[PDB]
Amino acid sequence: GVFTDIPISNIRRVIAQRLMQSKQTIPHYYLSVDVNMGEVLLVRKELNKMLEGRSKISVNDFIIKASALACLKVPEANSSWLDTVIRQNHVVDISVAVSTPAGLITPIVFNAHIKGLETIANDVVSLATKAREGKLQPHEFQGGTFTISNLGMFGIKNFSAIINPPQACILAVGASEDRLFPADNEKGFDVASMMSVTLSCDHRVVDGAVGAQWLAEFRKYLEKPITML
Amino acid sequence: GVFTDIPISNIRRVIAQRLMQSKQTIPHYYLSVDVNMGEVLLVRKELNKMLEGRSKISVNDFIIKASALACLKVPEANSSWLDTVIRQNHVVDISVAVSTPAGLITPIVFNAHIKGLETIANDVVSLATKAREGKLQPHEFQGGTFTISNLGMFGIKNFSAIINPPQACILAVGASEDRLFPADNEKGFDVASMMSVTLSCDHRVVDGAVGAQWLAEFRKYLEKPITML
Amino acid sequence: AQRLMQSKQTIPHYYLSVDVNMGEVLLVRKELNKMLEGRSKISVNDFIIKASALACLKVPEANSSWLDTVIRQNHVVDISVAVSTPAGLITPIVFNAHIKGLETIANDVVSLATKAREGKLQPHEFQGGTFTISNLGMFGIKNFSAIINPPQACILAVGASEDRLFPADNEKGFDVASMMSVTLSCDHRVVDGAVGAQWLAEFRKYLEKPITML
């Protein structure tokens, strides 16, 4: 025929009310900056060489570590509005979003401000075995104080997601491309890799100047990785 | 005096309630990509040569054809949320938006997945005679399953429109500019034309990975037009 | 043997001919098969089915049928491709060839070879159609002239792609090019001389520049 009618399952029945609660109440406003990823690609080149056989370190692992350290400098991006109490947290719990064919479910990486890179890289892979094959506990994917969502593996340059209702921030990462800049070369130009980031704050707990300094710290760690020490 | 008071007519009285219904209920989220338009400009150069006198083919005609073919590969961007039934359509009905001095009215191009380019180009022009001179039937501009809105004729690089309430997607096209890329030239760089596109999905029926593949197909047709066959 | 004798006695056949430059089709299917790796393969007998279905829309009198009181004019192109089994000559039907793309037709021609050669056809799958393409270029035949199906008004007949040479504006004076010889066979009761000569003027024009198919 012309149109085909499909009933609604119980997974999307629950998700569709979390989305409508989030957009009606929370006054979103967006921010943007682009990050030079030229020095991360030379660090993970030789960290994977010294760490042969055991594990592998990806570019989505430096982003989880740099986000947990930047929330300690500016702690207002780690809060929650509870209509009477701005609950300020001291523990960073990054909820990485991953995409299954069944939907969009977010495993949680607890205590991301004390763990090293190799401990996180074996947590992201080991929770892909849990989430994609349906072995999650209800306390393993519900919670957290922050959220990173990545769509750079599909070619998207920018997007702007929807904040989890108790949380105040979310991140949104584009795809790493190849641009060129004016330099002090004899030619006049160099080539460099770039990456476009889009924060999405809650305006009730995060002002304009506060969230603009979160992206000033997040840019500074990923441009020189030695500063993470 | 200081301020001048104007009453509200019955055209903007109806539009202002469609807008407020759309933003309150639908949880929008945005996406973006840029498209190389270097090979479309060499096809419409010599299609207008072989089609002398009769009609003229514009760059806003390849976009209507590439959008109707991309909805067949990824059919979830062609649905509708009806609070109990996700009505999935099999017929693509693109509603092109045009701007009159009286307002913003959207003529409908029916069955855009079977028509050729010359049939669409004589439908867009012939509906400009209908819409701008006020000869539309109520079933000629109300309906459709998709929407393309173009503002590249004013210099806007990016924008993000508002979805029609029954529909799930909308498109938003910037203006074709002239950038330059690093190449394998002896110099090191080439010059190319680009164009910036901004999708705006409904998050209740379209996930993140689904809408990111719609822009992966839409980019692929307009970069090599022979793939449309 | 009774369908053949009915066809030649009643229908007053007359033949037509033209040759088509296939130089630009071979550069399109070279890079369509590159972008379509693994899934399917696009042959030169697939552009001919698509160009024939589009040319019947420009000149609709080559798509009719004589019924002795009514010239039934059709609006739906149903090309009946003829294929050769060891059991005989049977014609699977490709329905609605004027809206389908090239990859949809190429997976219909192969999938009906599984049906027809292995004997799994329904009687409504090979009986009908409004047009007929018959190809013998895989045996070296340059020209032939087939027999029209009795309700239908046209048939096509394709030769083998050879290599000729033409006078050009070269410094040498000549270039080399690939050619292909086509032979239409009309029914003179519904198709005149000037009408069928414009069908081959459109069929030649699509296959010489494939971008015109859009």
XYZ file of C-alpha atoms in Angstrom:
672
model
C 0.000 0.000 0.000
C 0.982 3.618 0.562
C 1.771 3.628 4.294
C 2.705 0.900 6.769
C 1.710 1.049 10.440
C 4.002 -0.217 13.214
C 3.195 -0.469 16.949
C 5.468 0.973 19.619
C 7.560 -1.363 21.777
C 8.282 -0.879 25.471
C 11.873 0.274 24.971
C 10.945 3.296 22.847
C 7.895 3.874 25.058
C 10.195 4.757 27.968
C 12.763 6.709 25.923
C 10.136 8.952 24.304
C 9.096 10.360 27.687
C 12.658 11.032 28.839
C 13.169 13.078 25.666
C 10.006 15.149 26.026
C 10.760 15.849 29.695
C 14.258 17.022 28.784
C 13.429 19.576 26.089
C 10.382 21.172 27.756
C 11.966 21.951 31.130
C 15.676 22.541 30.433
C 16.612 25.820 28.654
C 19.420 24.623 26.377
C 22.004 26.869 24.773
C 24.912 25.767 22.640
C 28.642 26.506 22.408
C 31.399 25.585 19.973
C 35.173 25.530 19.471
C 37.616 23.520 17.350
C 40.556 21.547 18.733
C 43.911 20.843 17.113
C 44.505 17.094 17.363
C 48.039 17.211 15.978
C 49.888 16.208 19.135
C 47.545 13.466 20.319
C 48.240 11.440 17.163
C 51.972 11.395 17.935
C 51.424 10.240 21.516
C 49.062 7.344 20.771
C 51.375 6.268 17.951
C 54.151 5.424 20.402
C 52.002 4.419 23.362
C 50.615 1.576 21.248
C 54.196 0.637 20.380
C 55.275 0.343 24.023
C 52.044 -1.497 24.892
C 52.258 -4.338 22.339
C 49.857 -7.271 22.400
C 47.894 -6.342 25.532
C 45.565 -3.453 24.658
C 45.002 -0.664 22.153
C 44.500 3.046 22.837
C 42.104 5.010 20.638
C 41.428 8.712 20.151
C 38.111 8.323 21.991
C 40.169 7.543 25.112
C 42.051 10.845 25.398
C 38.689 12.624 25.221
C 37.334 10.767 28.260
C 40.459 11.554 30.282
C 40.632 15.225 29.285
C 36.950 15.707 30.104
C 37.318 14.294 33.611
C 40.275 16.544 34.397
C 38.589 19.673 33.036
C 35.577 19.205 35.322
C 37.882 19.511 38.338
C 39.137 22.969 37.348
C 35.632 24.285 36.606
C 33.308 22.357 38.958
C 30.078 24.134 37.986
C 29.794 21.976 34.846
C 29.361 18.949 37.141
C 26.257 20.003 39.069
C 22.543 19.180 39.007
C 19.398 21.298 39.362
C 16.916 19.762 41.820
C 14.521 22.786 41.980
C 15.643 23.670 45.533
C 19.276 22.472 45.723
C 22.099 22.810 43.201
C 23.752 19.492 44.063
C 27.468 19.910 43.365
C 29.328 16.639 42.859
C 32.940 15.805 43.680
C 33.047 12.509 41.738
C 33.189 12.524 37.934
C 31.149 9.698 36.380
C 31.327 9.966 32.590
C 28.505 8.193 30.748
C 29.801 7.282 27.287
C 26.987 6.724 24.784
C 27.244 3.721 22.457
C 24.904 2.686 19.641
C 23.458 -0.822 19.399
C 20.970 -1.956 16.735
C 18.404 -2.174 19.558
C 18.749 1.509 20.469
C 21.011 4.009 22.214
C 22.284 2.890 25.621
C 24.932 4.568 27.786
C 27.404 2.525 29.859
C 29.051 4.339 32.755
C 32.774 4.703 33.466
C 33.066 5.331 37.202
C 35.813 7.524 38.705
C 37.370 8.810 35.508
C 39.581 11.379 37.246
C 41.928 8.887 38.935
C 42.182 6.133 36.322
C 44.947 5.953 33.737
C 44.469 5.554 30.006
C 44.933 1.779 29.901
C 42.353 1.230 32.641
C 39.737 3.234 30.714
C 40.474 1.518 27.388
C 39.779 -1.867 28.956
C 36.572 -0.501 30.478
C 35.126 0.856 27.224
C 35.765 -2.398 25.344
C 34.564 -4.620 28.195
C 31.312 -2.670 28.481
C 30.725 -3.165 24.760
C 30.539 -6.884 25.539
C 27.999 -6.110 28.264
C 25.781 -3.569 26.497
C 25.599 -4.939 22.948
C 24.953 -8.500 24.178
C 22.407 -7.441 26.804
C 24.128 -8.329 30.087
C 23.749 -4.957 31.821
C 22.581 -4.413 35.374
C 20.188 -1.471 35.903
C 22.805 0.317 38.013
C 25.447 -0.035 35.282
C 23.864 2.269 32.685
C 21.646 4.586 34.784
C 23.387 7.441 36.562
C 26.513 9.476 35.940
C 27.206 13.202 36.099
C 28.426 13.916 32.547
C 27.949 12.535 29.043
C 30.153 12.183 25.971
C 28.543 11.292 22.646
C 30.655 10.630 19.554
C 29.515 10.560 15.917
C 32.836 11.202 14.187
C 32.801 7.680 12.752
C 30.037 8.656 10.289
C 31.417 11.909 8.861
C 29.267 14.362 10.842
C 31.121 17.640 11.405
C 28.867 19.158 14.086
C 25.755 18.196 15.990
C 23.968 19.208 19.191
C 22.495 16.482 21.372
C 19.893 16.559 24.162
C 20.968 16.671 27.830
C 20.084 13.853 30.231
C 17.426 15.258 32.553
C 19.302 15.174 35.845
C 22.629 16.172 34.237
C 23.705 19.696 33.276
C 26.139 19.184 30.371
C 26.724 16.941 27.369
C 29.481 16.841 24.779
C 29.251 16.335 21.030
C 32.288 15.473 18.927
C 32.591 15.839 15.167
C 34.889 14.071 12.749
C 38.623 14.691 12.481
C 39.331 16.402 9.162
C 42.331 17.993 7.469
C 42.476 21.785 7.194
C 45.259 24.242 6.457
C 46.374 27.378 8.283
C 48.471 30.453 7.520
C 51.895 29.907 9.038
C 55.328 31.502 9.036
C 56.508 29.054 6.362
C 58.475 30.090 3.285
C 55.388 28.950 1.370
C 53.097 30.652 3.884
C 50.896 27.734 4.937
C 51.002 24.424 6.790
C 48.573 21.505 7.010
C 47.039 20.312 10.271
C 44.313 18.030 11.598
C 41.317 19.604 13.329
C 38.227 18.455 15.203
C 35.009 20.322 15.977
C 33.428 20.114 19.439
C 29.965 21.311 20.506
C 29.030 21.706 24.175
C 25.368 21.995 25.223
C 24.889 23.540 28.655
C 21.929 24.070 30.948
C 21.568 27.820 31.394
C 20.053 27.571 34.886
C 23.258 26.293 36.538
C 25.916 27.227 33.948
C 26.411 30.826 32.837
C 28.047 31.999 29.627
C 31.487 32.800 31.012
C 31.673 29.599 33.070
C 31.007 27.210 30.195
C 33.367 29.170 27.958
C 36.221 28.375 30.354
C 35.427 24.660 30.322
C 36.204 24.643 26.605
C 39.310 26.714 27.327
C 40.643 23.925 29.547
C 39.434 21.054 27.354
C 41.230 22.577 24.378
C 44.424 23.069 26.362
C 44.874 19.476 27.539
C 44.287 17.874 24.137
C 46.653 20.259 22.381
C 49.617 19.357 24.636
C 49.094 15.987 26.357
C 52.035 16.404 28.766
C 49.901 18.910 30.705
C 47.721 15.972 31.865
C 50.398 15.006 34.425
C 5.481 58.573 18.303
C 7.802 56.016 19.869
C 6.002 52.751 19.062
C 3.429 51.771 16.444
C 0.773 49.120 17.087
C -0.383 46.708 14.368
C -3.210 44.134 14.605
C -2.725 40.494 13.659
C -4.247 39.165 10.434
C -5.785 35.724 9.988
C -2.851 34.288 8.034
C -0.312 34.844 10.817
C -2.960 33.879 13.384
C -2.932 30.310 12.042
C 0.838 30.083 11.472
C 1.692 31.216 15.013
C -0.078 28.200 16.522
C 1.567 25.689 14.186
C 4.947 27.047 15.303
C 4.222 26.873 19.026
C 2.844 23.335 18.699
C 5.985 22.252 16.853
C 8.645 23.456 19.291
C 6.922 22.430 22.544
C 6.221 18.794 21.652
C 9.006 17.748 19.256
C 12.505 17.241 20.770
C 14.698 18.646 17.991
C 18.385 17.919 17.575
C 20.601 19.126 14.772
C 23.207 17.629 12.431
C 25.628 19.044 9.877
C 27.953 18.132 7.005
C 29.376 19.937 3.967
C 28.993 18.750 0.377
C 31.378 19.196 -2.536
C 29.354 20.609 -5.429
C 32.178 20.404 -7.959
C 30.706 17.715 -10.194
C 27.112 18.936 -10.258
C 28.193 22.194 -11.917
C 29.739 20.275 -14.826
C 26.617 18.173 -15.362
C 24.078 21.014 -15.401
C 26.397 22.968 -17.694
C 25.945 20.437 -20.489
C 22.411 19.324 -19.677
C 21.255 22.886 -20.344
C 23.176 22.767 -23.623
C 21.410 19.617 -24.842
C 18.048 20.965 -23.628
C 18.029 24.310 -25.486
C 14.963 26.539 -25.564
C 12.561 24.282 -23.650
C 13.511 24.401 -19.959
C 16.341 25.245 -17.581
C 17.833 23.072 -14.838
C 18.997 24.723 -11.619
C 21.092 23.552 -8.679
C 17.953 23.448 -6.517
C 16.747 20.604 -8.764
C 19.537 18.103 -8.071
C 18.855 18.571 -4.354
C 15.206 17.528 -4.701
C 16.158 14.422 -6.681
C 19.004 13.371 -4.378
C 16.788 13.789 -1.314
C 14.059 11.545 -2.710
C 16.519 8.775 -3.544
C 18.251 8.938 -0.158
C 14.967 8.408 1.696
C 14.593 5.033 -0.029
C 17.899 3.697 1.314
C 17.205 4.893 4.872
C 13.397 4.778 5.254
C 13.263 5.835 8.915
C 13.725 9.492 7.912
C 10.338 9.285 6.149
C 8.109 8.333 9.081
C 5.640 10.100 11.372
C 4.955 9.903 15.113
C 1.229 9.567 15.864
C 1.601 8.817 19.634
C 0.602 5.152 19.150
C 1.764 4.295 15.604
C 5.012 5.143 13.822
C 3.451 5.483 10.367
C 6.140 4.519 7.855
C 5.538 5.854 4.352
C 6.525 4.323 1.020
C 5.814 7.439 -1.084
C 8.180 10.418 -0.966
C 6.343 13.758 -1.157
C 8.869 16.592 -0.903
C 7.394 19.925 0.197
C 9.640 22.672 -1.179
C 9.279 25.939 0.740
C 9.053 29.168 -1.267
C 8.858 32.750 0.001
C 6.158 35.162 -1.160
C 5.734 38.723 0.149
C 2.516 37.486 1.796
C 4.317 34.844 3.868
C 5.971 31.432 3.669
C 3.966 28.805 1.782
C 5.097 25.320 0.734
C 4.003 23.782 -2.585
C 4.229 20.003 -2.828
C 6.046 17.939 -5.461
C 4.334 14.546 -5.489
C 6.216 11.304 -6.242
C 9.735 12.681 -6.410
C 11.404 9.259 -6.524
C 10.210 8.290 -10.018
C 10.300 11.625 -11.847
C 13.249 12.796 -13.915
C 14.991 16.139 -13.598
C 13.093 17.894 -16.390
C 9.723 16.888 -14.941
C 10.627 18.380 -11.545
C 12.017 21.610 -13.027
C 8.712 22.251 -14.781
C 6.853 21.508 -11.546
C 8.811 23.959 -9.384
C 8.377 26.816 -11.869
C 4.712 26.046 -12.559
C 3.912 26.024 -8.842
C 5.532 29.443 -8.503
C 2.781 30.696 -10.815
C 0.220 29.045 -8.540
C 1.559 30.007 -5.108
C 2.783 33.571 -5.655
C -0.393 34.550 -7.541
C -2.734 32.840 -5.069
C -4.284 30.040 -7.139
C -3.552 27.151 -4.767
C -5.999 24.464 -3.730
C -5.895 23.459 -0.036
C -4.685 19.975 -0.988
C -1.815 21.391 -3.067
C 0.230 22.905 -0.223
C -0.878 20.889 2.843
C 0.680 17.463 3.268
C 3.951 15.862 2.247
C 6.418 13.676 4.123
C 9.630 15.732 3.862
C 10.659 19.371 3.529
C 13.495 21.214 1.802
C 14.088 24.873 2.637
C 16.703 26.915 0.781
C 18.220 30.258 1.810
C 21.443 30.150 -0.199
C 20.219 33.021 -2.372
C 20.761 35.493 0.501
C 24.278 34.562 1.641
C 23.356 32.549 4.751
C 25.951 29.848 5.432
C 24.007 27.768 7.975
C 20.605 27.819 9.608
C 18.307 25.405 11.438
C 14.599 25.511 10.668
C 11.554 24.169 12.535
C 10.007 20.804 11.581
C 6.434 20.572 10.291
C 4.418 18.977 13.089
C 3.419 15.723 11.421
C 6.780 15.343 9.630
C 10.009 14.015 11.151
C 12.776 15.719 9.137
C 13.578 19.000 7.410
C 16.575 20.138 5.398
C 18.399 23.459 5.459
C 20.809 24.482 2.714
C 23.441 27.199 2.935
C 25.106 29.175 0.181
C 27.665 27.762 -2.239
C 31.043 29.329 -1.479
C 34.626 28.843 -2.631
C 37.094 27.166 -0.270
C 40.493 25.574 -0.750
C 41.845 22.194 0.330
C 45.248 20.565 0.771
C 45.884 18.404 -2.270
C 48.692 16.412 -3.846
C 49.502 19.319 -6.176
C 53.025 20.574 -6.823
C 51.821 23.752 -5.107
C 50.065 21.730 -2.406
C 46.523 23.090 -2.685
C 43.530 23.182 -5.015
C 40.362 25.288 -5.072
C 36.872 23.808 -4.865
C 33.254 24.825 -4.349
C 31.506 23.740 -1.152
C 28.026 23.899 0.345
C 26.903 23.513 3.954
C 23.844 21.411 4.825
C 22.021 21.205 8.169
C 19.544 18.416 8.927
C 17.090 18.737 11.836
C 15.678 15.414 13.004
C 13.001 14.375 15.466
C 14.737 12.324 18.144
C 11.673 10.193 18.934
C 11.679 8.358 15.578
C 15.229 9.030 14.310
C 18.275 7.992 16.329
C 21.777 9.404 16.029
C 23.291 6.689 13.855
C 20.283 6.535 11.524
C 20.241 10.229 10.647
C 24.017 10.225 10.249
C 23.671 7.687 7.430
C 21.078 9.801 5.629
C 23.719 12.501 5.240
C 26.194 9.817 4.180
C 23.954 8.926 1.234
C 22.927 12.504 0.418
C 26.582 13.502 0.210
C 27.421 10.546 -2.012
C 24.854 11.194 -4.748
C 25.634 14.896 -5.145
C 29.374 14.301 -5.298
C 29.109 11.887 -8.262
C 25.816 12.337 -10.147
C 26.220 9.169 -12.247
C 25.365 7.158 -9.114
C 21.759 8.433 -9.427
C 21.117 5.910 -12.233
C 5.029 -23.620 -34.301
C 1.495 -22.204 -34.396
C 2.453 -18.904 -32.766
C 5.077 -18.458 -35.492
C 2.752 -19.214 -38.396
C 0.074 -16.895 -36.991
C 2.624 -14.093 -36.676
C 4.042 -14.077 -40.205
C 0.771 -14.564 -42.120
C -1.210 -11.733 -40.519
C 1.356 -9.070 -39.563
C 2.917 -7.046 -42.437
C 6.504 -6.702 -41.205
C 8.974 -4.122 -42.444
C 12.487 -3.598 -41.177
C 14.664 -0.653 -40.124
C 18.317 -0.233 -39.196
C 20.842 2.146 -37.627
C 24.202 1.790 -35.868
C 24.962 3.100 -32.384
C 28.252 4.371 -30.993
C 28.859 2.542 -27.715
C 31.951 4.532 -26.774
C 30.524 6.357 -23.769
C 28.599 3.475 -22.220
C 31.832 1.521 -21.708
C 33.288 4.351 -19.611
C 30.195 4.586 -17.414
C 29.858 0.879 -16.593
C 33.599 0.755 -15.921
C 33.246 3.053 -12.918
C 29.749 2.048 -11.847
C 31.071 -1.463 -11.213
C 33.903 0.097 -9.210
C 31.557 2.013 -6.897
C 29.276 -1.036 -6.592
C 31.853 -3.606 -5.410
C 30.837 -7.062 -4.231
C 27.055 -6.672 -4.491
C 26.102 -6.803 -8.180
C 27.485 -6.387 -11.686
C 26.169 -4.170 -14.484
C 26.382 -5.416 -18.068
C 25.930 -3.759 -21.452
C 22.621 -5.602 -21.883
C 21.310 -3.508 -18.969
C 21.702 -0.051 -20.524
C 19.744 -1.326 -23.531
C 16.734 -2.285 -21.400
C 16.720 1.108 -19.681
C 17.163 3.142 -22.871
C 14.375 1.209 -24.588
C 11.887 1.888 -21.800
C 12.605 5.617 -21.827
C 12.378 5.897 -25.617
C 8.884 4.382 -25.652
C 7.658 7.281 -23.509
C 8.727 9.929 -26.031
C 7.210 8.058 -28.991
C 4.232 6.131 -27.552
C 2.999 4.650 -30.843
C 5.691 1.945 -30.675
C 3.955 0.616 -27.537
C 0.507 -0.149 -28.948
C -1.409 -3.243 -30.057
C -3.726 -3.960 -32.992
C -6.931 -5.712 -31.883
C -8.786 -5.419 -35.258
C -11.186 -2.775 -33.873
C -9.161 -0.948 -31.185
C -5.561 0.269 -31.238
C -4.919 -0.336 -27.536
C -2.327 2.225 -26.444
C -0.455 1.281 -23.279
C 0.995 3.556 -20.606
C 3.069 0.857 -18.857
C 6.264 -0.451 -20.460
C 6.762 -4.192 -19.899
C 9.935 -5.312 -21.674
C 10.096 -9.044 -22.411
C 13.774 -10.005 -22.616
C 14.326 -13.221 -24.577
C 16.762 -15.778 -23.153
C 17.897 -19.082 -24.664
C 17.738 -22.350 -22.728
C 18.678 -25.759 -24.163
C 14.960 -26.615 -23.953
C 13.933 -23.745 -26.240
C 13.445 -19.982 -26.365
C 11.505 -18.536 -23.427
C 10.994 -14.862 -22.556
C 10.936 -13.660 -18.932
C 9.249 -10.320 -18.309
C 10.697 -7.265 -16.559
C 7.717 -5.284 -15.282
C 7.738 -1.467 -15.049
C 11.063 -0.784 -16.715
C 10.544 2.984 -16.919
C 10.788 3.678 -13.174
C 13.425 1.168 -12.067
C 17.109 1.999 -11.775
C 19.954 0.034 -13.312
C 20.782 -2.034 -10.229
C 17.166 -3.134 -9.804
C 17.027 -4.405 -13.403
C 20.387 -6.202 -13.186
C 19.146 -8.205 -10.209
C 15.933 -8.999 -12.084
C 17.620 -10.359 -15.218
C 19.935 -12.643 -13.229
C 17.211 -13.792 -10.826
C 14.913 -14.714 -13.712
C 17.699 -16.809 -15.222
C 17.432 -18.963 -12.097
C 13.682 -19.217 -12.683
C 13.567 -19.821 -16.440
C 16.550 -22.118 -17.012
C 15.638 -24.321 -14.026
C 11.928 -24.440 -14.878
C 10.311 -22.587 -11.966
C 8.246 -20.104 -13.991
C 4.612 -19.250 -13.402
C 2.465 -18.871 -16.551
C 1.967 -15.171 -15.802
C 5.726 -14.586 -15.497
C 6.676 -15.207 -19.140
C 3.421 -14.512 -21.042
C 2.569 -10.876 -21.666
C 4.564 -7.687 -22.063
C 4.343 -4.832 -24.550
C 7.844 -4.867 -26.085
C 10.628 -7.359 -26.765
C 14.422 -7.202 -26.812
C 16.363 -10.100 -28.316
C 20.161 -10.207 -28.175
C 22.515 -12.388 -30.232
C 25.704 -10.345 -29.946
C 27.313 -13.094 -27.867
C 27.664 -15.307 -30.973
C 29.189 -12.862 -33.469
C 26.050 -12.080 -35.494
C 26.204 -8.554 -36.922
C 22.553 -8.166 -37.969
C 19.378 -10.200 -37.836
C 15.628 -9.611 -38.050
C 13.367 -11.511 -35.677
C 9.618 -12.218 -35.724
C 7.196 -10.045 -33.716
C 5.095 -11.515 -30.902
C 1.527 -11.608 -32.207
C -0.114 -9.144 -29.840
C 2.935 -6.830 -29.772
C 3.871 -4.254 -32.414
C 7.676 -3.975 -32.159
C 10.752 -6.084 -31.464
C 14.427 -5.208 -31.239
C 17.437 -7.076 -32.587
C 20.966 -6.302 -31.433
C 24.171 -7.264 -33.214
C 27.662 -7.681 -31.838
C 29.886 -4.822 -30.706
C 32.783 -4.504 -33.145
C 35.641 -2.076 -33.724
C 35.463 0.283 -36.704
C 37.306 3.454 -37.637
C 36.029 6.853 -38.747
C 37.431 9.926 -40.483
C 38.168 12.510 -37.817
C 39.882 15.866 -37.462
C 43.046 14.162 -36.190
C 46.533 15.018 -37.420
C 46.526 11.469 -38.802
C 42.968 11.885 -40.082
C 41.251 8.944 -38.387
C 40.215 7.647 -34.976
C 39.052 4.239 -33.749
C 35.676 3.652 -32.117
C 33.359 0.848 -31.037
C 30.065 0.407 -32.884
C 26.953 -1.740 -32.610
C 24.282 -2.507 -35.203
C 20.588 -2.439 -34.266
C 17.628 -3.683 -36.328
C 14.046 -2.717 -35.468
C 11.107 -4.671 -36.928
C 7.828 -2.763 -36.847
C 4.228 -3.619 -37.628
C 3.181 -1.368 -40.496
C -0.495 -1.268 -39.483
C 0.102 0.757 -36.294
C 3.590 2.207 -36.914
C 4.316 4.375 -39.948
C 7.711 5.038 -41.496
C 8.393 8.421 -39.920
C 7.218 7.322 -36.466
C 9.510 4.309 -36.182
C 12.410 6.322 -37.576
C 12.141 8.683 -34.601
C 12.199 5.813 -32.112
C 15.683 4.957 -33.359
C 16.560 8.652 -33.206
C 15.840 8.661 -29.469
C 17.332 5.226 -28.767
C 20.578 6.304 -30.408
C 20.671 9.548 -28.446
C 20.418 8.060 -24.950
C 23.083 5.395 -25.467
C 25.540 7.855 -26.980
C 25.460 10.175 -23.929
C 24.189 8.358 -20.819
C 23.803 11.538 -18.732
C 20.700 12.348 -20.810
C 18.910 9.450 -19.045
C 18.429 11.643 -15.945
